[PDB]
Design a protein around this motif. Structure first.
Motif, PDB file in Angstrom:
ATOM      1  N   UNK A 163     -58.820  58.330  38.046  1.00  0.00           N
ATOM      2  CA  UNK A 163     -57.706  58.668  38.921  1.00  0.00           C
ATOM      3  C   UNK A 163     -56.408  58.917  38.165  1.00  0.00           C
ATOM      4  N   UNK A 164     -56.281  58.442  36.930  1.00  0.00           N
ATOM      5  CA  UNK A 164     -55.038  58.725  36.210  1.00  0.00           C
ATOM      6  C   UNK A 164     -55.163  59.982  35.358  1.00  0.00           C
ATOM      7  N   UNK A 165     -56.321  60.211  34.727  1.00  0.00           N
ATOM      8  CA  UNK A 165     -56.478  61.410  33.909  1.00  0.00           C
ATOM      9  C   UNK A 165     -56.187  62.661  34.729  1.00  0.00           C
ATOM     10  N   UNK A 166     -56.804  62.763  35.904  1.00  0.00           N
ATOM     11  CA  UNK A 166     -56.463  63.744  36.926  1.00  0.00           C
ATOM     12  C   UNK A 166     -55.702  63.040  38.034  1.00  0.00           C
ATOM     13  N   UNK A 178     -52.744  61.843  37.852  1.00  0.00           N
ATOM     14  CA  UNK A 178     -51.901  60.772  37.347  1.00  0.00           C
ATOM     15  C   UNK A 178     -50.424  60.921  37.660  1.00  0.00           C
ATOM     16  N   UNK A 179     -49.967  62.129  37.988  1.00  0.00           N
ATOM     17  CA  UNK A 179     -48.560  62.360  38.289  1.00  0.00           C
ATOM     18  C   UNK A 179     -48.287  62.433  39.788  1.00  0.00           C
ATOM     19  N   UNK A 180     -49.206  61.941  40.617  1.00  0.00           N
ATOM     20  CA  UNK A 180     -49.011  61.928  42.058  1.00  0.00           C
ATOM     21  C   UNK A 180     -48.781  60.534  42.630  1.00  0.00           C
ATOM     22  N   UNK A 181     -48.882  59.490  41.812  1.00  0.00           N
ATOM     23  CA  UNK A 181     -48.750  58.110  42.261  1.00  0.00           C
ATOM     24  C   UNK A 181     -48.412  57.244  41.056  1.00  0.00           C
ATOM     25  N   UNK A 182     -48.027  55.998  41.329  1.00  0.00           N
ATOM     26  CA  UNK A 182     -47.832  54.985  40.298  1.00  0.00           C
ATOM     27  C   UNK A 182     -48.728  53.794  40.599  1.00  0.00           C
ATOM     28  N   UNK A 183     -49.472  53.338  39.594  1.00  0.00           N
ATOM     29  CA  UNK A 183     -50.283  52.150  39.744  1.00  0.00           C
ATOM     30  C   UNK A 183     -50.150  51.265  38.521  1.00  0.00           C
ATOM     31  N   UNK A 184     -50.431  49.981  38.721  1.00  0.00           N
ATOM     32  CA  UNK A 184     -50.279  49.036  37.620  1.00  0.00           C
ATOM     33  C   UNK A 184     -50.961  47.724  37.971  1.00  0.00           C
ATOM     34  N   UNK A 185     -51.049  46.854  36.965  1.00  0.00           N
ATOM     35  CA  UNK A 185     -51.541  45.491  37.097  1.00  0.00           C
ATOM     36  C   UNK A 185     -50.385  44.500  37.012  1.00  0.00           C
ATOM     37  N   UNK A 186     -50.609  43.309  37.563  1.00  0.00           N
ATOM     38  CA  UNK A 186     -49.766  42.165  37.280  1.00  0.00           C
ATOM     39  C   UNK A 186     -48.521  41.999  38.133  1.00  0.00           C
ATOM     40  N   UNK A 187     -47.720  41.033  37.682  1.00  0.00           N
ATOM     41  CA  UNK A 187     -46.502  40.676  38.395  1.00  0.00           C
ATOM     42  C   UNK A 187     -45.510  41.828  38.432  1.00  0.00           C
TER      43      UNK A 187
END
Lengths: 186, 47, 195, 49
Positions: free
Chosen positions: C1-4, C6-15
């Motif tokens: 989902x980030x390779x293609x 990747x510039x349509x949303x922001x995602x991450x792990x953690x606090x």
RNA sequence: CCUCGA
DNA sequence: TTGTGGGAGCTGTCACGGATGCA
DNA sequence: TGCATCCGTGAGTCGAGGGT
């Protein structure tokens, strides 16, 4: 290329770290210590990964990095104060420590009397003339340098030092039993 | 010297800004005191 | 989902992700929704809604933000409240609080080192989880996972433990104290006394 | 170097965070301890266009 | 904490 | 910093309430 | 959405000395 070889580093090395966690756990016995040791190992490995001979066994190389990072931290502790944690240091421990300290656990009474007059001393001081008493007070209690205690009292340095030495003499005339009552006769 | 007549005792959550307004400096080092001189290391837990 | 894409949303792990969520969080919107679910719903949905509304309405009725539930900075208690004393034997005794703060410091510094060295994302994530877990210990040890231990396998009393039980500040140092002008001795009968 | 969550509000039953954001605590443990990602924002307009 | 006292 | 490499205990407690998770 | 399971809580007071 730099970044391609870091991707190669990830791919080749990460399972090795999975097993090296168990190794470091066996050699430290504390899981938090083991995680710290493994992350330190990975720091050192990623810093010096260019110096790795491709194709050989990276297992032994990384295990040696882990062994040496454990060996270096064992010596780092031998130069820092040996610390031992407890829920609550005890009263016998506070007391033992106070036995060799420069202030110790002072009682309210001790501090009450220090805030009351020292009757022997107060009367000896009040015996001295006002200017002698002042030149003795500033210099001997308040540690002002001689030019600065001259700045006080509005008198030259010679006058202040004459007053200081002669008031010290006179106050030594008095206080002669106090110095014997306490340990100053030695 | 507090005359000991408080009306209220309130809690909130500390903002990181509050946590910084309390602080007199960041602790940066894990050292506590030097084994040789028994003195508190700079920027340590007893700085 | 980030390779293609990747510039349509922001995602991450953690606090950091949880913090970004709390940022974009509309307390008035979710509060109104929960009030609606309570007013017009029934059964378990009503129960869960009232539960969640207690938190949400508390956060909106008081002007404090939920951002405070995520820390960028950790305070440090004065050192007299976490003393260190020399013992017979050349050894020292420290409060557990110092070992906990020291692990927090080690992990934060190693994280800074990794971030500067541009370490692999997996290793930096390891260090971030480790920093999180060490702050979990410092605040309330043993609540999640294995407690951080000292020698002899004892869980380090954390800032939470300093308050709980008959050992904690409340029941041990505020509701009862040790006092001056007091003594103690064995009792004997002495029948010659008046009441 | 990286923010952390106050364990009083993640793991303190009932999870105050889990009630705040309407997340199940199991998912919160996955996120906060780097077991799973979460979407913090999505550009709906760009996706649409 | 351990062993003990009421 | 290169032939191989995974812990030490643990459980011989119990009643109660409410979230949490599962299906 | 309906519960079963799990997990988190609490479990008397004051003394003495010993002392990793």
């Amino acid at each position: 290329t730099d970044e391609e070889l870091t991707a190669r580093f990830e791919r080749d090395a990460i399972p090795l770290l999975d097993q090296l966690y168990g190794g470091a756990l066996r050699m430290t016995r504390n899981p938090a210590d083991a995680e710290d040791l493994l992350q330190e190992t990975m720091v050192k490995a990623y810093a010096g990964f260019r110096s790795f001979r491709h194709g050989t066994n990276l297992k032994a190389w990384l295990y040696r990095i882990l062994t040496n990072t454990y060996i270096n931290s064992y010596r780092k502790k031998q130069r820092q104060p040996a610390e031992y944690p407890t829920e609550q240091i005890t009263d016998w421990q506070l007391a033992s420590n106070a036995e060799h300290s420069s202030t110790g656990l002072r009682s309210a009474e001790v501090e009450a009397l220090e805030a009351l007059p020292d009757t022997e001393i107060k009367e000896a001081l009040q015996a001295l003339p006002e200017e002698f008493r002042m030149a003795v007070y500033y210099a001997d209690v308040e540690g002002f340098p001689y030019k600065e205690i001259a700045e006080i009292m509005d008198t030259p340095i010679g006058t202040v030092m004459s007053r200081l030495h002669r008031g010290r003499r006179q106050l030594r005339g008095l206080l002669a039993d106090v110095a014997r009552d306490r340990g100053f006769a030695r | 010297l507090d005359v000991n007549f408080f009306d209220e005792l309130r809690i909130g959550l500390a903002t990181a800004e509050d946590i910084r307004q309390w602080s007199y400096g960041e602790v940066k080092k894990p050292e506590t005191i030097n084994y040789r001189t028994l003195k508190p290391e700079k920027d340590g837990l007893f700085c | 989902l980030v390779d293609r894409y990747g510039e349509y949303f922001t995602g991450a792990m953690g606090a950091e992700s949880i913090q970004k969520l709390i940022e974009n969080f509309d307390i008035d919107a979710e509060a109104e929704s929960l009030r609606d679910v309570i007013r017009n719903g029934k059964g378990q949905k009503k129960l869960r809604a009232l539960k969640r509304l207690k938190v949400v309405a508390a956060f909106q009725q008081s002007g404090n933000s939920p951002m405070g539930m995520v820390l960028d900075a950790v305070p440090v208690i004065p050192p007299e409240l976490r003393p260190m004393v020399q013992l017979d034997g050349g050894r020292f005794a420290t409060s557990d609080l110092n070992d906990l703060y020291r692990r927090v410091i080690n992990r934060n510094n190693r994280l800074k080192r990794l971030i500067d060295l541009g370490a692999p994302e997996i290793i930096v994530n390891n260090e971030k989880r480790m920093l999180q877990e060490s702050v979990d210990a410092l605040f309330d040890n043993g609540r999640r996972g294995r407690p951080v231990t000292g020698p002899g396998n004892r869980p380090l009393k954390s800032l939470s433990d300093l308050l709980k039980g008959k050992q904690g500040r409340f029941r041990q140092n505020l509701l009862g104290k040790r006092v001056d002008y007091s003594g103690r001795s064995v009792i004997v009968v002495g029948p010659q006394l008046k009441l | 170097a990286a923010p952390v969550t106050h364990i009083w509000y993640f793991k303190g039953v009932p999870s105050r965070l889990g009630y705040l954001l309407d997340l199940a605590p199991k998912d919160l443990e996955k996120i906060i301890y780097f077991a799973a990602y979460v979407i913090t924002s999505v550009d709906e307009e760009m996706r649409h266009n």
